[PDB]
Design a protein around this ligand. Structure first.
Ligand SMILES: CC(C)[C@@H](NC(=O)[C@H](CS)NC(=O)CCC[C@H](N)C(=O)O)C(=O)O
Ligand SMILES: [Fe+3]
Length: 328
C-alpha cells in the first residue's frame, strides 16, 4: 500500500491582509484538491495540545448512567428530538467506537429554527457540570475556535476557484450554521471484538468503510495514530498522521457545486488496536443556504446543475451515510 501526497499548507496568510500571499495559499489548496483531495492546514493558531486528552478523559470518565441520559435517539427511544446531538454508545463485543456530537451553541429554545422544529436543528445536551467541570466551556469555545479557522479556509477555497474570498464564508454564519463537532474515542481492546472489524474488498481490516464526507469541507484533528486512507485510481493510499495539523478535505456539497472539479475524496478508516481520538468539524452552511453551481473547467464557467439548499442536502446525506455504513 502506497502513501498519499498530503501537503502541509501554512494557512496563516488566510487570516491576514496580504492578498498576494493569500493567493499563494489558494494555489496550494487548488493543487491539493485536484490531487488526492487532502491537505494538512498548519500554522493554524488553534491550541490542539489538550484536545485529545480532554476527549479521552471525557469518554473514560462518563458513566453508563450518564451515557443513557445523553444518548441520541438511536440508543434511547425516550430522546426523539436527539437525531444528531448527544452520546453515541459503544456496544462491547460488537461496536468499539463511541462519540459525543454537539451542534451550534446558538441553537436554543429561542432560536426560530428550534421554534419551527426544522429538521437537523437541535439544542445541545450536556453532562452535569460538577461531574465534568469545564467540559461544556471547553467544547463551546472549541466550536468557535474551529469556526474561525474554517472561515479562513473557506476564503482559501474561494480564491482557489477564481471567486471573491467570501464566496463560501458569507453563507457560514454563527447564527445559523449547521456545523457539528464530534468527539470520537477509538478504544484499545484486548481481545478486540472481530465483530467490530470489517474486511474491505482488498482485504484491509477496517473500523469504518468507504464514504464521502457530508459537508462543504471537513476540518479534522486526530491524535497521532495513523488510520485514514484515501482512494485513488491506483487504490487506497495511507494518509500519514500529523499531531498538530488539521486534515482538510472537500465534502460532497463542494463536489456538486464545482461540477466535480473539486471531488469529495472517498476515505476509509483502517482498524488499529490503539487508544486514539478523532475530532471532526463538519463545515455545514445554513438550512436555507444555496450556492449556485459553476464549472471552473468551462470558459464561460457555466454549469447546468441545480442549486441545492444545504439543509435538505444535509438531511439526505446524514441518513444515507447511516444506511450505508451503519449507525455510529
Ligand atoms: C475521520 C472520520 C473517518 C471519522 N468519522 C466520521 O467523521 C463519521 C463517519 S464518516 N462521520 C459521520 O458519521 C457523520 C457525523 C455527522 C454528525 N453526527 C452530525 O449530526 O453532524 C472517524 O475518525 O471515524
Ligand atoms: Fe469522512
Amino acid at each position: 500500500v502506497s502513501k498519499a501526497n498530503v501537503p502541509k499548507i501554512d494557512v496563516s496568510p488566510l487570516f491576514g491582509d496580504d492578498q498576494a500571499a493569500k493567493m499563494r495559499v489558494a494555489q496550494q489548496i487548488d493543487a491539493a484538491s485536484r490531487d488526492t483531495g487532502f491537505f494538512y492546514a498548519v500554522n493554524h493558531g488553534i491550541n490542539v495540545q489538550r484536545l485529545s486528552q480532554k476527549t479521552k478523559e471525557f469518554h473514560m470518565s462518563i458513566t453508563p448512567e450518564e451515557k443513557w441520559d445523553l444518548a441520541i435517539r438511536a440508543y434511547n427511544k425516550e430522546h426523539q428530538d436527539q437525531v444528531r446531538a448527544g452520546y453515541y454508545l459503544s456496544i462491547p463485543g460488537k461496536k468499539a467506537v463511541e462519540s459525543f456530537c454537539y451542534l451550534n451553541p446558538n441553537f436554543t429554545p429561542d432560536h426560530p429554527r428550534i421554534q419551527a422544529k426544522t429538521p437537523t436543528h437541535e439544542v445541545n445536551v450536556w453532562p452535569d457540570e460538577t461531574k465534568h467541570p469545564g467540559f461544556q466551556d471547553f467544547a463551546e469555545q472549541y466550536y468557535w475556535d474551529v469556526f474561525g479557522l474554517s472561515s479562513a479556509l473557506l476564503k482559501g477555497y474561494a480564491l482557489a476557484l477564481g471567486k471573491e474570498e467570501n464566496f463560501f464564508a458569507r453563507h457560514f454564519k454563527p447564527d445559523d450554521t449547521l456545523a457539528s463537532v464530534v468527539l470520537i474515542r477509538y478504544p484499545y481492546l484486548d481481545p478486540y471484538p472481530e465483530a467490530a472489524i470489517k474486511t474491505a474488498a482488498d482485504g484491509t481490516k477496517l473500523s469504518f468503510e468507504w464514504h464521502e464526507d457530508v459537508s462543504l469541507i471537513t476540518v479534522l484533528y486526530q491524535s497521532n495514530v495513523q488510520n485514514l486512507q484515501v482512494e485513488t485510481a491506483a487504490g487506497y493510499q495511507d494518509i500519514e498522521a500529523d499531531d498538530t495539523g488539521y486534515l482538510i478535505n472537500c465534502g460532497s456539497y463542494m463536489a456538486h457545486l464545482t461540477n466535480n472539479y473539486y471531488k469529495a475524496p472517498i476515505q476509509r478508516v483502517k482498524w488499529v488496536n490503539a487508544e486514539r481520538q478523532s475530532l471532526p468539524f463538519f463545515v455545514n452552511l445554513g438550512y436555507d443556504s444555496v450556492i449556485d453551481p459553476f464549472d471552473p473547467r468551462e470558459p464561460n464557467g457555466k454549469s447546468d446543475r441545480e442549486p441545492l439548499s444545504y439543509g435538505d442536502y444535509l438531511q439526505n446525506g446524514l441518513v444515507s451515510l447511516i444506511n450505508k455504513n451503519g449507525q455510529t
